[PDB]
């Protein structure tokens, strides 16, 4: 309904102008507001098929139907003559700053989603605060503004992956004619960490400057929602106070889990600690088999480490298991050992970490396999990657009424709204959604536009592409082969597949038939592409563009009629022809 | 409609079976042909909409309306009892080999297009010959089977590009913690060339094995079409003879042009000579400004050469000129010199090439700028990259009646047919088509299927993506910005753009705002994407997947609703928002 949209837009927007692009009265009001440095949203009624119906609905509030009409926080302010009179009498600034709450928007959490939502809301005149606080890890690690991805996630992880990839580039360079000897070259962990941490510091600073430039209030304080519109904040000096806000966005993210075994918290570490560790981990055990576990084990092996991965059941649960097994097989042939069907029982300390000279300690890990056989081996570093969890008990008083699911994540509708109407949740704490940085950013930006600029567009969470940055990378978009068969039946699924060899690997004498790709397709729906999978170098660059085509409903015929770019790895998708049902080998 | 297709299919197929997937008599004939090693096309009438009508039309040739029906070279052979009779009496092999011509197909040219067409035709039972001969360059260079891309084009060019990219990987590795010193490392040209040529040699041999295993006759002989069905061949011993073919595919490609100046042929070289040259070119002049010219200049500079490019007018004529200027600016900041608005007049020899000590000669180059000022400088190597041309006078007697355009390329209809009904042309000699290896391969394969398997699908030559492999790579799909404005007018064109920085460049301390991308869109057609452009690392991997979405009619909204993969370069296409008309800076 047009009238329900208009009622919601008026009640929600901080400062909004209803306009037409061809009206010189509307242009004149825009110029007044611009000169007054008053930020606002604008709706151009002449670009909307229902613009005339909107004009009649506006008279509900204003008892006029003409354009322009200015609103502030649910209340009609005036037409052109009224707005210009307030300005000429120096009354306009006071009217547009009048609010019942301290802020139009309070964002709890200053990470991927929360910073994006706060910056976007401020563009439309929402008076906005962003709260961020980083509870230290058990050994004391903490960091600055920007969230998990910036400080202890995608950003440092991919930079250390790049340092690992450069090991193989140095080797390949000999074959391509360069005079170096890879056998005589080693890696300095502390030099890498110093550069990674210096880049992260520039990002912390840039986010502070960006908030100041958008007139967003940044508070380095711990927030707790105690009623629908009240947030209790605790200072760095432990001073406690309360601020109020009209809309609330919860964006507090997750932290790593520890297993409930003796010694884990005291003597192990997680990804939170790894990316700033001042000593090389040395002989390392990674416990777990998530993409975090395998990414970290992979680059530690390429940087000279002796690395073992302890796997409870399978690798990359939730991902296509043919692809997961090929990922691990490459890792095992390139220096990662696996202890399969095995879990830990206790971590004992044999030597304390030498903080003065930057050397790891020594640990005795005891565990057991599923048959019953015992595990016992010494490691210098033990990294836990056994999942991540929110801690919303700290963030959210139970009496507010925001409903959580059985894992402690927020139950939201398709507009990110919680069970309390003015409170929203974005990012990793939103139950059921893919836990990825560009998802959090899109959700936050799009939500701010609906609240403060009358937008209607929702975030689309389907067929979101992924890439696992293991030593040989794995990109995917859509269904695994096993999920497609479960949903539609084996007789309705056709799979096209092929190995390939990067041209860069020929002169370098690397493997002929390890890189692999496949398209999982539905026969009865014009051979629709249900899922795309690729194992190879630069897999995130390969996969990204196809995600647009899959959103558009690409079929196998759409891939066939498109011409390849030569020489690339990605062009192999344009000539796939071997089906799995045919039994013909996929090798090159 | 159906009747015209059936007549064309029956007349041109070598061996074809009309069948139904469920009929055990058709299965019986299939098993017989498989046991006899008789290759054939198959049309399954039950899987075609007009299958019932086709069956009734078949009686115009066979006088029966049932399946199976087997035909050979336009003649009905029999149903199941009849085919079994021939096999039982050892008569079937002679029947399926009866032909008025020596071959069903003669392919003149064994490169990208011709090898693809010959292998595909042989799969359907066409008796096929492929002719290939490599006329030596002026200094005597020759090479093996596979054409321009394999021997003196895309394959060696990208391998030498990779050797050049590794110079920056060695530099970057220091910042990521590796102990090498790039200052102390040098490149050995001849070690590179040895590895490149070993890979090329494996491709030459692989193509010979592939033709042998597909029962294709390979003749290392120069061919000349002297009438619609007669090809005159000259072998290695200058023996001349004539072979005949039903269908002819011309696929003889192009070779480099030389300027008509004194000394050019005697003392300069082209890309044909570069990729097997036994010595490093040294101080080099590249004359020209095509993608061949700039790609070669770029990797020679990265491999330690003192390189200059002589540009007659503009860089990359035919490509988006904003992008071309950005490509050249990067090369100029990374060690390539440019002599702009300049042309050569003569090449004089100062030193003969030193075969004793494996060293280039030395040359004096005289030229002039467009204002008349003189150019005079000494170089060890002069490379001409001033275009490529066919020389179809050698391939084609004018009395055959095959029409050529004003540049000497073959004028074809949209099914690759020439003005002579049994003669077809594919690849670089087909007038007006993009001159790229995957285009030649698609055209050859799809043509073979139409001639010998009853296919109707044509090759689509629109919006074929490209990548220029300069030191910073340039990928593109669709229209340049200036071509879009010329076609639709400035007011109907909206351009979104952004700079970006690869994450890999941060710790390596490389440039902040050199990489660049834009989408050129049509306002009045739902903001349709007319052209996509990207300058950055791995640009061919970035561009390829978007070529599918553009083929499908992607709009700007399709890019916006798609979620990025983080951290990648390609994800920057999913969040573009700055327009050129706004005047807002694209830097980040
Ligand atoms: C090792 C690792 C690698 C990853 N790699 C990738 C990758 O390659 N690609 C990808 O797309 N995603 C990746 N991710 C996931 C990505 O990091 C997350 O999806 C993203 O960070 C989630 O953003 P968010 O806004 O939901 O939360 P966060 O970024 O976690 O931000 C929440 C912030 O709120 C703070 N906070 C918590 N409680 C309070 C409170 N009471 N008051 C104030 N502030 C509070 C937190 O300390 C934090 O600063 C990775 C994650 C990890 C752990
Ligand atoms: C330096 C360079 C770089 C390139 N890089 C790329 C790139 O990155 N990507 C891309 O897609 N394309 C690239 N190309 C273009 C690509 O090489 C061509 O488009 C492709 O090779 C054309 O194939 P074709 O089958 O038409 O001809 P060709 O591959 O040239 O094959 C024709 C063959 O026929 C032979 N022949 C000629 N006359 C006769 C005769 N009378 N009898 C018998 N045989 C004969 C020729 O000697 C040759 O072997 C590049 C080209 C060059 C020169
Ligand atoms: C750029 C800008 C915009 C507004 C003002 C303030 N008032 C006027 O200019 C008065 C007028 C009303 C109608 C026509 S002029 C000053 C400067
Ligand atoms: C599976 C298979 C494969 C080849 C053949 C060849 N044809 C015969 O042997 C002739 C007959 C056998 C039975 C009735 S006619 C037949 C079957």
What's the CATH number where B26 sits?
3.40.30.10
- Long-range contact pairs involving B313-317 (C-beta distance under 8 Å, separation at least 24): B313/B289, B313/B341, B314/B289, B315/B289, B316/B289, B316/B290, B316/B291, B316/B468, B317/B289, B317/B290
Q: Which residues of B are annotated as a binding site for NAD(+)?
A: 288-295, 387
In angstroms, rounded to a whole number, what is the distance separating the alpha carbons of residues A509 and B520?
41
Q: What is the CATH number of the domain that holds B493?
A: 3.30.390.30
Yes or no: say if B410 and B392 are a contact pair by the CB < 8 Å rule: yes
In angstroms, rounded to a whole number, what is the distance separating the alpha carbons of residues A549 and A564?
15
Describe the strand order of the beta sheet including A75-78 as a list of residue ranges: A41-44, A15-19, A69-72, A75-78
Q: Which residues of B are annotated as a binding site for glutathione?
A: 20, 55, 67, 80-81, 222, 225, 397
Yes or no: say if A149 and A155 are a contact pair by the CB < 8 Å rule: yes
Q: Which residue has the tokens 């390429």?
A: A302
Q: Is the dihedral of CA A338, A339, A343, A345 positive or negative?
A: negative
Pairing between β-strand A474-478 and β-strand A336-340 as defined by DSSP bridges: unpaired
Residue A485: phi and psi, rounded to 5, are: -65, -40
Q: What residues contact A550, with CB distance under 8 A and at least 6 apart?
A: A463, A477, A478, A529, A532
Q: What residues contact B82, with CB distance under 8 A and at least 6 apart?
A: none
Q: Are residues A552 and A507 in the same domain?
A: yes
- For residue B154, how many other CB atoms are within 10 A of its CB? 18
In angstroms, rounded to a whole number, what is the distance separating the alpha carbons of residues B132 and A200?
58
Packed helices B154-175 and B189-213: angle between N→C axes, nearest 10 degrees: 140
Nearest CA among B469, B487, B478, B496 for reference residue B557: B496
Residue B396: phi and psi, rounded to 5, are: -140, 115
Q: Are residues A438 and A571 in the same domain?
A: no
Q: What are the structure tokens assigned to A13, written together? A: 């927007």
Host H or E run for residue A545: helix A539-551
Residue A252: phi and psi, rounded to 5, are: -95, -5
Tallying the residues shown for chain A, one arrives at 588
In angstroms, rounded to a whole number, what is the distance separating the alpha carbons of residues A551 and B160?
37
In angstroms, rounded to a whole number, what is the distance separating the alpha carbons of residues A119 and A448?
9
The response to whether residue B367 sits with its C-beta less than 6 Å from ligand 2 reads no
Selected for mutation to probe chain A from B116, B445, B567 (highest A CB count within 10 Å) is B567
Yes or no: say if B179 and A187 are a contact pair by the CB < 8 Å rule: yes
The answer to the question of residue A80 being in a domain is yes
Host H or E run for residue B451: helix B437-453
Q: What are the structure tokens assigned to B87, written together? A: 């096999």
In angstroms, rounded to a whole number, what is the distance separating the alpha carbons of residues A473 and A542?
11
Which ligand sits closest to the CA of B146? 2
Burial class (CB in 10 A: 0-12, 13-18, 19+), B126: buried
Closest-CA distance, A441 to chain B, in angstroms, reads 10
Three-class secondary structure of residue B200 per DSSP? helix
- For residue B240, how many other CB atoms are within 10 A of its CB? 11
Cα B65 from chain centre: 44
Residue B165: phi and psi, rounded to 5, are: -60, -35
In angstroms, rounded to a whole number, what is the distance separating the alpha carbons of residues B64 and B556?
56
The response to whether residue B110 sits with its C-beta less than 6 Å from ligand 2 reads yes
- For residue B254, how many other CB atoms are within 10 A of its CB? 18
Report the largest interatomic distance among the alpha carbons of chain A, rounded to a whole angstrom: 85
Q: What residues contact B422, with CB distance under 8 A and at least 6 apart?
A: B228, B229, B246, B247, B248
In angstroms, rounded to a whole number, what is the distance separating the alpha carbons of residues B393 and B395?
6
Nearest CA among B415, B341, B337, B408 for reference residue B379: B337
Q: What are the structure tokens assigned to B322, written together? A: 């904003």
End-to-end CA distance of chain B: 58
Nearest CA among B517, B390, B379, B423 for reference residue B230: B423
- For residue B313, how many other CB atoms are within 10 A of its CB? 11
Yes or no: say if B245 and B102 are a contact pair by the CB < 8 Å rule: yes
Q: What are the structure tokens assigned to B545, written together? A: 């997947």
Rg (CA), chain A: 28
Q: Are residues B34 and B144 in the same domain?
A: no
In angstroms, rounded to a whole number, what is the distance separating the alpha carbons of residues B504 and B527?
33
Closest-CA distance, B189 to chain A, in angstroms, reads 7
In angstroms, rounded to a whole number, what is the distance separating the alpha carbons of residues B405 and B393?
13
Packed helices A321-333 and A291-302: angle between N→C axes, nearest 10 degrees: 20
Burial class (CB in 10 A: 0-12, 13-18, 19+), A135: exposed
Q: What are the structure tokens assigned to B416, written together? A: 């690759």
The response to whether residue B292 sits with its C-beta less than 6 Å from ligand 2 reads yes
The answer to the question of residue B518 being in a domain is yes
Instruction: List all residues whose CB is within 6 A of at least one atom of ligand 4.
Output: B 31-32, 35, 84
In angstroms, rounded to a whole number, what is the distance separating the alpha carbons of residues A409 and A578?
43
Q: How far is the CA of A135 from the centre of ligand 1 (A)?
A: 13
The answer to the question of residue B361 being in a domain is yes
Q: Are residues A381 and A294 in the same domain?
A: yes
Q: Are residues B202 and B241 in the same domain?
A: yes
Q: Which residue has the tokens 């391969």?
A: B441
Yes or no: say if A92 and A78 are a contact pair by the CB < 8 Å rule: no
Q: What are the structure tokens assigned to B445, written together? A: 């394969």
- With an 8 Å Cβ cutoff, are A199 and B506 in contact? yes
Selected for mutation to probe chain A from B568, B575, B588 (highest A CB count within 10 Å) is B568
The DSSP result for B473-530, as a single string, is -EEEEE--HHHHHHHH-GGGEEEEEEEE--THHHHTT--SS-EEEEEEEEGGGTTEEE
In angstroms, rounded to a whole number, what is the distance separating the alpha carbons of residues A497 and A535?
12
In angstroms, rounded to a whole number, what is the distance separating the alpha carbons of residues A142 and A158?
20
Which residue, of B386, B405, B424, is where some domain finishes?
Answer: B386
Instruction: Count how many domains chain B has.
Output: 4
The response to whether residue A153 sits with its C-beta less than 6 Å from ligand 1 reads yes
CA atoms within 13 Å, Cβ hemisphere of A40: 26
Fill in the DSSP letter of residue B309. E
Q: What are the structure tokens assigned to B302, written together? A: 């990265």
B533 in catalytic set: no
In angstroms, rounded to a whole number, what is the distance separating the alpha carbons of residues B187 and A477?
41
Nearest CA among B364, B384, B459 for reference residue B417: B459
Yes or no: say if B247 and B105 are a contact pair by the CB < 8 Å rule: yes
Q: Is the dihedral of CA B186, B192, B194, B198 positive or negative?
A: positive
Selected for mutation to probe chain B from A192, A568, A569, A588 (highest B CB count within 10 Å) is A568
Residue A270: phi and psi, rounded to 5, are: -130, 180
Which residue, of A332, A361, A386, is where some domain finishes?
Answer: A386
What are the b/e assignments for A297-317, b being 16+ CB within 10 Å?
A: bbbbbbbebbbbbbbbeebbe
Q: What are the structure tokens assigned to B321, written together? A: 């000129």
Residue A293 CA: distances (Å) to CA of A148, A200, A478, A534 = 16, 22, 23, 20
Q: What are the structure tokens assigned to A123, written together? A: 């563009």
In angstroms, rounded to a whole number, what is the distance separating the alpha carbons of residues A228 and A401?
8
In angstroms, rounded to a whole number, what is the distance separating the alpha carbons of residues A247 and A228?
9
Host H or E run for residue A484: helix A481-488
The answer to the question of residue B569 being in a domain is yes
The answer to the question of residue B223 being in a domain is yes
In angstroms, rounded to a whole number, what is the distance separating the alpha carbons of residues B292 and B224?
29
Closest-CA distance, B111 to chain A, in angstroms, reads 15
In angstroms, rounded to a whole number, what is the distance separating the alpha carbons of residues A576 and A562?
12
Closest-CA distance, B347 to chain A, in angstroms, reads 31
Q: Is the dihedral of CA B181, B185, B191, B197 positive or negative?
A: positive
Yes or no: say if B222 and B133 are a contact pair by the CB < 8 Å rule: yes
In angstroms, rounded to a whole number, what is the distance separating the alpha carbons of residues A372 and A353?
32
Nearest CA among B113, B86, B112, B116 for reference residue B98: B86
Q: Are residues B408 and B352 in the same domain?
A: no
Q: What are the structure tokens assigned to A53, written together? A: 């119906």
Pairing between β-strand B342-351 and β-strand B362-369 as defined by DSSP bridges: antiparallel
In angstroms, rounded to a whole number, what is the distance separating the alpha carbons of residues B251 and B244?
17
Q: Are residues A86 and A115 in the same domain?
A: no
- With an 8 Å Cβ cutoff, are A154 and B567 in contact? yes
Q: What is the CATH number of the domain that holds A272?
A: 3.50.50.60
The answer to the question of residue A586 being in a domain is no
What are the b/e assignments for A552-585, b being 16+ CB within 10 Å?
A: bebbbebbbbbbbbbbbbbbbbbbbebeeeeeee
Yes or no: say if B467 and B307 are a contact pair by the CB < 8 Å rule: no
The answer to the question of residue A173 being in a domain is no
Q: Are residues B443 and B487 in the same domain?
A: no
Yes or no: say if A107 and A118 are a contact pair by the CB < 8 Å rule: yes
Q: Kindly compute the dihedral angle of the four CA atoms of residues B440, B446, B451, B455, in this order, to the nearest 10 degrees.
A: -170
Q: Does B187 touch chain A (CB under 8 A)?
A: yes
- For residue A166, how many other CB atoms are within 10 A of its CB? 26
Residue A49 CA: distances (Å) to CA of A44, A185, A342 = 11, 67, 62
Q: What residues contact A284, with CB distance under 8 A and at least 6 apart?
A: A297, A300, A305, A306, A307, A308, A379, A380, A381, A382, A383
Yes or no: say if A548 and B532 are a contact pair by the CB < 8 Å rule: no
Q: What residues contact B471, with CB distance under 8 A and at least 6 apart?
A: B164, B165, B298, B299, B301, B302, B330, B331, B334
- With an 8 Å Cβ cutoff, are A465 and B563 in contact? yes
Yes or no: say if B320 and B481 are a contact pair by the CB < 8 Å rule: yes
Yes or no: say if A92 and A38 are a contact pair by the CB < 8 Å rule: yes
The response to whether residue A32 sits with its C-beta less than 6 Å from ligand 3 reads yes
- For residue A60, how many other CB atoms are within 10 A of its CB? 12
Yes or no: say if A248 and A225 are a contact pair by the CB < 8 Å rule: yes
Cα B418 from chain centre: 20
Q: Are residues A420 and A327 in the same domain?
A: no
Three-class secondary structure of residue B368 per DSSP? strand
Yes or no: say if B479 and B530 are a contact pair by the CB < 8 Å rule: yes
Fill in the DSSP letter of residue B205. H
Q: Are residues B368 and B393 in the same domain?
A: no
Yes or no: say if B476 and B465 are a contact pair by the CB < 8 Å rule: yes
The DSSP result for B105-143, as a single string, is EEEE--SHHHHHHHHHHHTTT--EEEE---PPPTT----
Q: What residues contact A75, with CB distance under 8 A and at least 6 apart?
A: none
Task: List beta partners, residue A519.
Answer: A496, A532
Domain limits at B229? Answer: 103-160+190-255+389-453
Nearest CA among A74, A67, A104 for reference residue A6: A74
Host H or E run for residue B356: none
Q: What residues contact A375, with CB distance under 8 A and at least 6 apart?
A: A310, A339, A342, A344, A365, A366, A367, A368, A369
Fill in the DSSP letter of residue A404. B
Residue B159: phi and psi, rounded to 5, are: -70, -40
Burial class (CB in 10 A: 0-12, 13-18, 19+), B5: middle
Pairing between β-strand B222-227 and β-strand A128-131 as defined by DSSP bridges: unpaired
Which ligand sits closest to the CA of B38? 4
Yes or no: say if B336 and B307 are a contact pair by the CB < 8 Å rule: yes
Burial class (CB in 10 A: 0-12, 13-18, 19+), B101: middle
Fill in the DSSP letter of residue A562. S
In angstroms, rounded to a whole number, what is the distance separating the alpha carbons of residues B571 and B588?
14
- With an 8 Å Cβ cutoff, are B177 and A163 in contact? yes
Which residue, of B386, B403, B419, is where some domain finishes?
Answer: B386
Fill in the DSSP letter of residue A216. P
Q: Is the dihedral of CA B40, B44, B50, B53 positive or negative?
A: positive
Residue B319: left if φ>0, alpha if ψ -120 to 50, beta else—which one?
beta
Q: Are residues A328 and A411 in the same domain?
A: no
Method by which this entry was solved? X-ray
Three-class secondary structure of residue A557 per DSSP? helix
In angstroms, rounded to a whole number, what is the distance separating the alpha carbons of residues B300 and B303?
5
Yes or no: say if A26 and A79 are a contact pair by the CB < 8 Å rule: no
Q: What are the structure tokens assigned to A225, written together? A: 């929602």
The answer to the question of residue B173 being in a domain is no
Fill in the DSSP letter of residue A556. H
Q: Are residues B153 and B251 in the same domain?
A: yes
In angstroms, rounded to a whole number, what is the distance separating the alpha carbons of residues B571 and B542?
9
């Amino acid at each position: 309904g047009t009238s329900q949209w208009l009622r919601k837009t008026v009640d929600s927007a901080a400062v909004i102008l209803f306009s037409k692009t061809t009206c010189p009265y509307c242009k004149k009001v825009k110029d007044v507001l611009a000169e007054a440095k008053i930020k606002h949203a604008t709706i151009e009624l002449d670009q909307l098929s229902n613009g005339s119906a909107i004009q009649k609905c506006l008279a509900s509030f204003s008892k006029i139907e003409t354009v322009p009409q200015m609103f502030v926080r649910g209340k009609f302010i005036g037409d052109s003559q009224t707005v210009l009179k307030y300005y000429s009498n120096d009354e306009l600034a006071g009217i547009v700053n009048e609010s019942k709450y301290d802020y139009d928007l309070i964002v709890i959490g200053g990470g991927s989603g929360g910073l994006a939502a706060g910056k976007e809301a401020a563009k439309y005149g929402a008076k906005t605060a962003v709260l961020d606080y980083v509870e230290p890890t058990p050994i004391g690690t903490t960091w600055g503004l920007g969230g998990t991805c910036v400080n202890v996630g995608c950003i440092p992880k991919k930079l250390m992956h790049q340092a690992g990839l450069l090991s193989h580039a140095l080797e390949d360079a000999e074959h391509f004619g360069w005079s170096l000897d890879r056998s005589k070259i080693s890696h300095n962990w502390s030099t890498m960490v110093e550069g990674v941490q210096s880049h992260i510091g520039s990002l912390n600073w840039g986010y502070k400057v960006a908030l100041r430039d958008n007139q967003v209030t940044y508070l380095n304080a711990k927030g707790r929602l105690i009623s629908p519109h009240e947030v209790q904040i605790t200072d760095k000096n432990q001073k406690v106070s309360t601020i109020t806000g009209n809309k609330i966005i919860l964006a507090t993210g997750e932290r790593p889990k520890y297993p409930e075994i003796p010694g884990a918290v005291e003597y192990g570490i997680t990804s939170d600690d790894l990316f700033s560790l001042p000593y090389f981990p040395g002989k390392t055990l990674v416990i777990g088999a998530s993409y975090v576990a395998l990414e970290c084990a992979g680059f530690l092996a390429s940087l000279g480490g002796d690395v073992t991965v302890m796997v409870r059941s399978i690798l990359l649960r939730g991902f296509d298991q043919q692809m997961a097994e090929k990922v691990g097989d490459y890792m095992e042939n390139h220096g990662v050992k696996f202890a399969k069907l095995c879990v830990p029982d206790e971590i004992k300390q044999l030597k304390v970490v030498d903080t003065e000279n930057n050397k790891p300690g020594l640990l005795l890990v005891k565990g057991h396999y599923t048959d019953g056989k015992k595990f016992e081996e010494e490691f210098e570093t033990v990294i836990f990657a056994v999942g991540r969890e929110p801690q919303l008990s700290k963030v959210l008083c139970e009496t507010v009424g925001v409903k959580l699911d059985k894992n402690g994540r927020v139950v939201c509708t398709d507009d990110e709204q919680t069970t309390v109407s003015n409170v929203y949740a974005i990012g990793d704490i939103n139950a059921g959604k893919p836990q990825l940085t560009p998802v959090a950013i899109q959700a936050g930006r799009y939500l701010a536009r609906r609240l403060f600029a009358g937008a209607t567009e929702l975030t689309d969470y389907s067929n979101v592409a992924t890439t696992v940055f293991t030593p040989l990378e794995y990109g995917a978009c859509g269904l695994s082969e096993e999920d497609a068969i479960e949903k539609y039946g084996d007789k309705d699924i056709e799979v096209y597949h092929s190995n390939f060899k990067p041209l860069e690997w020929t002169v370098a004498h690397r493997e002929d038939n390890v890189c692999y790709m496949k398209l999982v397709c539905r026969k009865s729906d014009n051979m629709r592409v249900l899922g795309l999978h690729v194992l190879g170098p630069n897999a995130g660059e390969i996969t990204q563009g196809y995600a647009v085509a899959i959103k558009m409903g690409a079929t196998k015929a759409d891939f066939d009629r498109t011409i390849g770019i030569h020489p690339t790895c990605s062009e192999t998708f344009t000539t796939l022809h071997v089906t799995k049902k045919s039994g013909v080998s996929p090798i090159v």
